[PDB]
Amino acid sequence: VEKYQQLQKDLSKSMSGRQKLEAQLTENNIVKEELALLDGSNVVFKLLGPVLVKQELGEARATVGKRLDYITAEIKRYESQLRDLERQSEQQRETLAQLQQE
Amino acid sequence: ADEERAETARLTSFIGAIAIGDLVKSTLGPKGMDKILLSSGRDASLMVTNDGATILKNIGVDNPAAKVLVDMSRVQDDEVGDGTTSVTVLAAELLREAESLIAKKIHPQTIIAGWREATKAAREALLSSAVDHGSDEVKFRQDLMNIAGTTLSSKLLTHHKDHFTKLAVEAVLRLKGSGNLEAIHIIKKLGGSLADSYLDEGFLLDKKIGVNQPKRIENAKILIANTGMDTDKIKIFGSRVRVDSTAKVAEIEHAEKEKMKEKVERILKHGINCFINRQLIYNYPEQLFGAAGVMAIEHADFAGVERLALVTGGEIASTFDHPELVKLGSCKLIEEVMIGEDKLIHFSGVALGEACTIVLRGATQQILDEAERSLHDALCVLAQTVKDSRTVYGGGCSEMLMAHAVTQLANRTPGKEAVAMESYAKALRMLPTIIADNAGYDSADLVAQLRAAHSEGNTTAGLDMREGTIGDMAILGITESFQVKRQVLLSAAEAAEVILRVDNIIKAA
Amino acid sequence: DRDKPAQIRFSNISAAKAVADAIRTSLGPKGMDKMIQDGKGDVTITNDGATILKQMQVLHPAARMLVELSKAQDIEAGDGTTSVVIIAGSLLDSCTKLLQKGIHPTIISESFQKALEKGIEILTDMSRPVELSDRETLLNSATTSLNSKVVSQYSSLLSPMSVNAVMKVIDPATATSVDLRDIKIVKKLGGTIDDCELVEGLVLTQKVSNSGITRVEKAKIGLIQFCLSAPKTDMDNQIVVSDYAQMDRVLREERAYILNLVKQIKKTGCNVLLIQKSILRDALSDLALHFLNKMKIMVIKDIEREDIEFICKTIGTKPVAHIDQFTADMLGSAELAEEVNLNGSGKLLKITGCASPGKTVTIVVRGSNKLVIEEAERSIHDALCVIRCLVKKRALIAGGGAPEIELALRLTEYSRTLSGMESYCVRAFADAMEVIPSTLAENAGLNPISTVTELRNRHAQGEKTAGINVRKGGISNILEELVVQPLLVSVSALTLATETVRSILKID
Amino acid sequence: EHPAAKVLCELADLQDKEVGDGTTSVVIIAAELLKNADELVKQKIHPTSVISGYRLACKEAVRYINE
Amino acid sequence: KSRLMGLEALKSHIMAAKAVANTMRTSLGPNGLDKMMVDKDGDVTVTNDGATILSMMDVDHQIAKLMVELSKSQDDEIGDGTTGVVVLAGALLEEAEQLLDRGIHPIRIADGYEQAARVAIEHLDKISDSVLVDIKDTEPLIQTAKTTLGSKVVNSCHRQMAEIAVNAVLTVADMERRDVDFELIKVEGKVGGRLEDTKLIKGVIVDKDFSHPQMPKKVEDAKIAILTCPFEPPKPKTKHKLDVTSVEDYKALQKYEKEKFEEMIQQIKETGANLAICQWGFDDEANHLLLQNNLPAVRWVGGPEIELIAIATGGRIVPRFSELTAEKLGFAGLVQEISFGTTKDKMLVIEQCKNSRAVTIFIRGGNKMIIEEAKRSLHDALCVIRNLIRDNRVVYGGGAAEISCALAVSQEADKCPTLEQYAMRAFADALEVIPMALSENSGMNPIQTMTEVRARQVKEMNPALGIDCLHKGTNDMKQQHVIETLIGKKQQISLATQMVRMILKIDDIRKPGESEE
Structure with missing residues (x-):
């Protein structure tokens, strides 16, 4: 029954964005190595928004760290919302399953 | 559910309360010999007390007599303060004496009737033992000095008692009228040494806004405030908690400052020398309070500030419902004074004349927690003594005459009255026992000395367990406030005859 | 009636003393090790009684007083902590006597802490005031103390450190108490x-x-x-x-x-x-x-x-x-x-x-x-403790229990001087003392009962003329080879007996 | 299984770490002087009294080891 | 599945009444030392009569069981003499085994006891006055509430309750034509006032709802409006979310509040009784916005209260605010806003001279103990007059009838003879137990003390005088003014032999293995 689905639905929904963070998180680590590697040897660039800002080395690492951090925090965001959306489905299942049935 | 009938209960109600009225009287008295406190809840966890109120707490006792006598000495703590462990043994000197009569077959009814008017026959002899020392302000201050140490000693304070024996009477000397705890602002504070305790004459804020806001404020305009700067109190100058947008939880914090700005303007709209706010003042309106050049007092006391509202004459903003209308406190000078290890806001020359603020200096909390309680008992006593300024001849010197009196009463009368009353006046005569016995001195002679005194009758001389022997009753401190005594003597006198009604104890247990 | 409290008190008497005793054998550098089992299944070799209080016990309250007692003496000094165990029972030894006599806990009490005053006075002059401004005199005394005492290994090596940071936190020539x-x-x-x-x-x-x-x-x-x-x-x-x-x-x-x-x-x-x-x-x-x-x-x-x-x-x-x-x-x-x-x-x-x-x-x-x-860590500690003991108490008191052996002898006849029902009290009060170095004497061997008979008379004679000195651990001039302590560590170990007893005296 | 037995095997091993000589031995006079001094303390002796002497005695041998 | 034999069981039964009646025997009257209770749940308390204690005490045994059972009807109607039959029926109980011990039928003994009550009944019938009237019975109820308000909470009769006792029972009595119901009269304590705050309440008393006092405190009409409907927008004493989805709905609410206030101010007023008891709870905000409008608005009302005060009025309730009629409003003889105590809120006292189908007289207390100690006085003092108006008959009690009613019966014995004389003899003696037992619980030698009015009983007959119940040096029931409803004594008489008559009932003392199980 539809009530059971949204909770399953929003589950993998907010699950989707939470995962790709880790690959970003992974490359956030990949760039830290290079932001530890670059002294600014060749022009360092953040790009956030349709503008490409002038970026400086020293502000970039704390950024990507925050970016790493900010993303790293975002494993917890839905892992809260995971069980949230996971639970409300299960609760209605036996009901709505049997409701589907009879 | 289960009948507990007369005699076997009357043993149990006695024998426990008999046991109860002992380790308290053991401890009771200046030479009253201590009892180790035992917390079976935490290991053995121990103190060693002269206080029976502690005794009840640590080791829980079940006697209906006790549970009554618990409440009695407790209400003798709740009312009389000092006299708790004394009213305890007070009925204890009865029940043992009653054991005889009870074992003698003698109806509690008899004793109920008999010790009753016996209880009275001394009462006015006790009121005769009531002797005014109010006769001068100094003589009552001498009387303030009389029973002050009398209370605090058996409450277990001595070294730092003297300072409090000193300090408390003058704050209470400001009363000269009803003893007023409104007027008396209690501050007991950690910090300072045993000599650093202090009496502010006025109201005092032991908190300090110090450097951030005004410190010294003359001719104070004192605004007693419940005014939330962060609280969103009535006359909300921005978006409250309400639904407008789904993100409104954030939108509430935005209008907060545009609320904090206007509210300081409102708090400035009074105009004040100081702003006493029982709730939060945030750092931003702080300098806005500073933009009003006003001492910003936040999280202010819920009681002192009320006394401040009472003693300095302020009126609380009451959730800031009066942007002008609210009345304001005025003291001649607001002085932040370093006392002990901290600075304290002192309001000098507050509206109320009786008003003070005592400032106690605990070197630790162990010093800070114990004394101010013991400090309190005399004051309530003294407060009664302020109203009715009286002593009774101590060291049993009141006791023997009353014993004598009721005994002189006894001889002629003895229906079931003096039969009891004879057994009664003994309890009047049974206190000097333990006091010399806690002191470790043969009471019989000394008693019979003090007997042969009040047999002869006598006032100026009674048993002194200090020296250990009979001595002058000059109101030396050796003759002690009637206020306690009657109260005490009013109290356990009933509990016996009261509980004498219940040999009829029944138990759902 | 008060039997049970007396009994309790009697039990308290028996209990805490029964605890106070075994270390009197462990008493002193001449004292002995003690192998402490517990429920831990571990045998633990301990001369120090302060931990023996701590590390092993039951919860008995007068026994708790003891684990309370020296624990203070730790912070009171860090010195004579084992010895403030040794002081307490001696009085409590004299107590049941007076309780077999039946002297009253208030009477018993007030006689004693008083007499301690009376004691510390004669005791005080036995000690020698030494310069607390002079870090060398501070060095010397403490170092002499340190070398009159247990840890000289690093302490004496650390004594130039100890007294200095002290001398640093020493402002006055008095050198005050010098808290740590x-x-x-x-x-x-x-x-x-x-x-x-x-x-x-x-x-x-x-x-x-x-x-x-x-x-x-x-x-x-x-x-x-x-x-x-x-x-x-x-x-x-x-x-x-x-x-x-x-x-x-x-x-x-x-x-x-x-x-x-x-x-x-x-x-x-x-x-x-x-x-x-x-x-x-x-x-x-x-x-x-x-x-x-x-x-x-x-x-x-x-x-x-x-x-x-x-x-x-x-x-x-x-x-x-x-x-x-x-x-x-x-x-x-x-x-x-x-x-x-x-x-x-x-x-x-x-x-x-x-x-x-x-x-x-x-x-x-x-x-x-x-x-x-x-x-x-141990070394600086008491090196700093003797400092705090010596800077707070300038007067330098000899080790070896002689200070008793002089004073107990003294206070007796001064107790006698009192007359009153109480004159008996301060004697047994004083009498309690000299049994302490007695064990300590026997802890060094020989015969205290013989010795303490004599050292008493010695300390009726030149008063320091002979005494207990660890080199012998027996009759010697405590001054010849100096067995010395700051006046504090003594008076430290003093009142806790004359208090907790007087405390436990009036306890029901 | 005894604190002695505990205090010992280390010492023989202490000797045995050092040299195979005295190892099975030293436990001998470890036992000897005990039983020897056992009654001495029981006699009038205080365990401290002569125990220094046995060290002073322990030196005579090494005083003799010289010669 | 073990079975006691007859006398055995009764010997096992006789083991019961002894101690439980004993509890009364030193508790009888004020000279009786009243009863104490303690709990497995840890509550030590004082208890009284049989019922209080014997209900608070728990009863193991069929004998003990029937006690509370036998007890109820007593304290229900008369309220005074409850503890009595306990001793009495227990005494006769111990007279029964006795005559079985004397080898006399359990059958027969219970037989001649019954009409032995009659020769005590006819004896009691004569005693004192079978009459009282309004101005008269004021004074004995004064006396009754003398000994009632002087024996229990305070030993000082406080004439207020002493008169509060007389008036409202009359109020239900004079309504019911010299009949009255203890249900209708009701004794209501609320602490925070005093035992000297004591109120004669012929109507209902409830704290007047103020979500604001300053928004005018008032009582209006004399009449009450009892409402299941709103007098202001309604709510069932349960949380009602006040939020507004926009900043604008913030504006319309308080108007809606006041639009229905004035409308319910309108439509309940036109119904009647601007004071309106709305069964519904409601926000303290808008409740005082109607208060700000007008008419203190009663909200957060007990569901019982509305129908309670409804039936008392005899009027109905407005179930639905669209339904409006004054009969669905209540009836207050007087609605009166009354400050409850000096300590706390005004109440709204609805005193119903319109119809009171319940009358709850009121008192306060400095303590909940004493206030119930006082109600303990009040209930049973209202209980005597209850019957005592239904029959105004009173008999000087306290052993004077006991020493006397035994006279007829024990003298009726050899008038009777065969088994009845015994059942006259071992009957009547149980009466003089109590003056003995009252002298017992006193400091008094009972047989001695009993011997006294005995001589009187030979000297005089049926003394309106008697022995001191108050333990007064003088012995009357006149000087003592100890006189009980000549119902209640006989009402009490009815109880005692009945129990013995109960313990005999059938031949079955057997148990399946279930007896008390």
């Missing part, structure tokens, strides 16, 4: 007893510098009681997302301000920053802290609130929970704060000299090993 407060015991794994040193400014645990300043000087020392990371939301910082549009929009907010809150700190004039533990914190994001280390503040993070309070009380860096709450009072000034890696394992931060309330000295005890570090 500003004095900071520190250690370093390994190192050396020579790598031990006093330090004039606070040696601190490790350091945080990402871009952070290593050496900063005249350094205003910041406290942080506030989170620099912005509040922790789903990890350390502010995130709300079910989707990346959500995260990418609000990510603007968290990043910028934590930099600002970082900024203002250096704007508040922090050359050093004390950050207590990230649990004592919300947390510090090391990248904004790298942004903060970029502020070239000297960041010491994850540090104890105690050390915060120590650095608060001692060198005067007071708690800062807010940017506004940064203030020079709450910012200590480190004339040099620079970490040092050397003389032993790894690095501890060195504030080299510092602005301090009073004067804050610290000592870093390093060793051949950790035990050798502890061999210093």
Whole structure:
């Protein structure tokens, strides 16, 4: 029954964005190595928004760290919302399953 | 559910309360010999007390007599303060004496009737033992000095008692009228040494806004405030908690400052020398309070500030419902004074004349927690003594005459009255026992000395367990406030005859 | 009636004394080891009775008084703590006598602490006032003490350190009491007893510098009681997302301000920053802290609130929970704060000299090993204790129990002098004393009963003319080879007997 | 299984770490002087009294080891 | 599945009444030392009569069981003499085994006891006055509430309750034509006032709802409006979310509040009784916005209260605010806003001279103990007059009838003879137990003390005088003014032999293995 689905639905929904963070998180680590590697040897660039800002080395690492951090925090965001959306489905299942049935 | 009938209960109600009225009287008295406190809840966890109120707490006792006598000495703590462990043994000197009569077959009814008017026959002899020392302000201050140490000693304070024996009477000397705890602002504070305790004459804020806001404020305009700067109190100058947008939880914090700005303007709209706010003042309106050049007092006391509202004459903003209308406190000078290890806001020359603020200096909390309680008992006593300024001849010197009196009463009368009353006046005569016995001195002679005194009758001389022997009753401190005594003597006198009604104890247990 | 309390008291008498006894064999350097089993299934060889109180016991309250008793003597002195066990029972020995006599607990009590006064007086002059301004006389006496006492190994080697940081925290020629407060015991794994040193400014645990300043000087020392990371939301910082549009929009907010809150700190004039533990914190994001280390503040993070309070009380860096709450009072000034890696394992931060309330000295005890570090820890300890005992009590009292053996003998006839029902009390009171070095005498062997008969008369004669001296552990001039102690350690070990007894005397 | 037995095997091993000589031995006079001094303390002796002497006695041998 | 034999069981039964009647025997009257209770749940308390204690005490045994059973009807109607039959029926109980011990039928003994009550009944019938009237019975109820308000909470009769006792029972009595119901009269304590705050309440008393006092405190009409409907927008004493989805709905609410206030101010007023008891709870905000409008608005009302005060009025309730009629409003003889105590809120006292189908007289207390100690006085003092108006008959009690009613019966014995004389003899003696037992619980030698009015009983007959119940040096029931409803004594008489008559009932003392199980 539809009530059971949204909770399953929003589950993998907010699950989707939470995962790709880790690959970003992974490359956030990949760039830290290079932001530890670059002294600014060749022009360092953040790009956030349709503008490409002038970026400086020293502000970039704390950024990507925050970016790493900010993303790293975002494993917890839905892992809260995971069980949230996971639970409300299960609760209605036996009901709505049997409701589907009879 | 289960009948507990007369005699076997009357043993149990006695024998426990008999046991109860002992380790308290053991401890009771200046030479009253201590009892180790035992917390079976935490290991053995121990103190060693002269206080029976502690005794009840640590080791829980079940006697209906006790549970009554618990409440009695407790209400003798709740009312009389000092006299708790004394009213305890007070009925204890009865029940043992009653054991005889009870074992003698003698109806509690008899004793109920008999010790009753016996209880009275001394009462006015006790009121005769009531002797005014109010006769001068100094003589009552001498009387303030009389029973002050009398209370605090058996409450277990001595070294730092003297300072409090000193300090408390003058704050209470400001009363000269009803003893007023409104007027008396209690501050007991950690910090300072045993000599650093202090009496502010006025109201005092032991908190300090110090450097951030005004410190010294003359001719104070004192605004007693419940005014939330962060609280969103009535006359909300921005978006409250309400639904407008789904993100409104954030939108509430935005209008907060545009609320904090206007509210300081409102708090400035009074105009004040100081702003006493029982709730939060945030750092931003702080300098806005500073933009009003006003001492910003936040999280202010819920009681002192009320006394401040009472003693300095302020009126609380009451959730800031009066942007002008609210009345304001005025003291001649607001002085932040370093006392002990901290600075304290002192309001000098507050509206109320009786008003003070005592400032106690605990070197630790162990010093800070114990004394101010013991400090309190005399004051309530003294407060009664302020109203009715009286002593009774101590060291049993009141006791023997009353014993004598009721005994002189006894001889002629003895229906079931003096039969009891004879057994009664003994309890009047049974206190000097333990006091010399806690002191470790043969009471019989000394008693019979003090007997042969009040047999002869006598006032100026009674048993002194200090020296250990009979001595002058000059109101030396050796003759002690009637206020306690009657109260005490009013109290356990009933509990016996009261509980004498219940040999009829029944138990759902 | 009061039987049970008397019984209790009798039991209390029996109980605590039954505890007070076995160490009287362990009493002194001549005393013996004790192998302590517990429910731990472990046999533990112990001469020190203070731990024997601590390490092993039952919960008996008068036995609790004992584990209470010397524990105070630890902080009271750190000396005669075993011996304040030895003092108490002796009186309690004399007690049941007076209770077999039936003397009254108030009467029993008031006779005694009084008599202790009466005792300490004659006792006091036995002691010799020695110069507390002269660090050498301080050295000598304490060192003589130290060499009249248990630990000379590192203590005497550490005595130039001990008395100095003391002499540092000694302002007066009186040398006051000299509390150990500003004095900071520190250690370093390994190192050396020579790598031990006093330090004039606070040696601190490790350091945080990402871009952070290593050496900063005249350094205003910041406290942080506030989170620099912005509040922790789903990890350390502010995130709300079910989707990346959500995260990418609000990510603007968290990043910028934590930099600002970082900024203002250096704007508040922090050359050093004390950050207590990230649990004592919300947390510090090391990248904004790298942004903060970029502020070239000297960041010491994850540090104890105690050390915060120590650095608060001692060198005067007071708690800062807010940017506004940064203030020079709450910012200590480190004339040099620079970490040092050397003389032993790894690095501890060195504030080299510092602005301090009073004067804050610290000592870093390093060793051949950790035990050798502890061999210093023990060593400075009582080396500082005898100081606190000698500086607080100038008068230098001899060891060996002779001070009793003189005074007990004295107070007896002075108790006799009292007459009254009580004259018997102070005798047995005094009489209690000389049995203490008796065991100690027997702890050295021979026959105290023979000796203490005589040393008494010796201490009826020249009063110090002979006495107990550990070299013999028997009849000797306590002054010849000096067995000496500050007047304090004695009077330390004194009243706790004349109190807890007088306490336990009137106990029901 | 005894604190003595505990205090000993280390010492024989202490001897045995050093040299195979005295190892099975030293436990001997470890036992000897005990039983010897056992009654001495029981006699009038205080365990401290002569125990220094046995060291002073321990030196005579090494005083003799010289010669 | 073990079975006691007859006398055995009764010997096992006789083991019961002894101690439980004993508890009364030193508790009888004020000279009786009253009864104490303690709990497995840890509550020590004082208890009284049989019922209080014997209900608070728990009863193991069929004998003990029937006690509370036998007890109820007593204290229900008369309220005074409850503890009595306990001793009495227990005494006769111990007279029964006795005559079985004397080898006389359990059958027969219970036989001649019954009409032995009659020769005590006819004896009691004569005693004192079988009459009282309004101005008269004022004074004995004065006396009754003398000994009632002087024996229990305070030993000082406080004439207020002493008169509060007389008036409202009359109020239900004079309504019911010299009939009255203890249900209708009701004794209501609320502490925070005093035992000297004592109120004669012929109507209902409830705290007047103020979500604001300053928004005018008032009582209006004399009449009450009892409402299941709103007098202001309604709510069932349960949380009602006040939020507004926009900043604008913030504006319309308080208007809606006041639009229905004035409308319910309108439509309940036009119904009647601007004071309106709305069964519904409601926000303290808008409740005082109607208060701000007008008419203190009673909200958060007990669901019982509305129908309670409804039936008392005899009027109905408005179930639905669209339904409006004054009969669905209540009836207050007087609605009166009354400050409850000096300590706390005004109440709204609805005193119903319109119809009171319940009358709950009121008192306060400095303590909940004493206030119930006082109600303990009040109930049973209202219980005597209850019957005592239904029959105004009173008999000087306290052993004077006991020493006397035994006269007829024990003298009726050899008038009777065969088994009845015994059942006259071992009957009547149980009467003089109590003056003995009252002298017992006193400091008095009972047989001695009993011997006294005995001589009187030979000297005089059926003394309106008697022995001191108050333990007064003088012995009357006149000087003592100890006189009980000549119902209640006989009402009490009815109880005692009945129990013995109960313990005999059938031949079955057997148990399946279930007896008390």
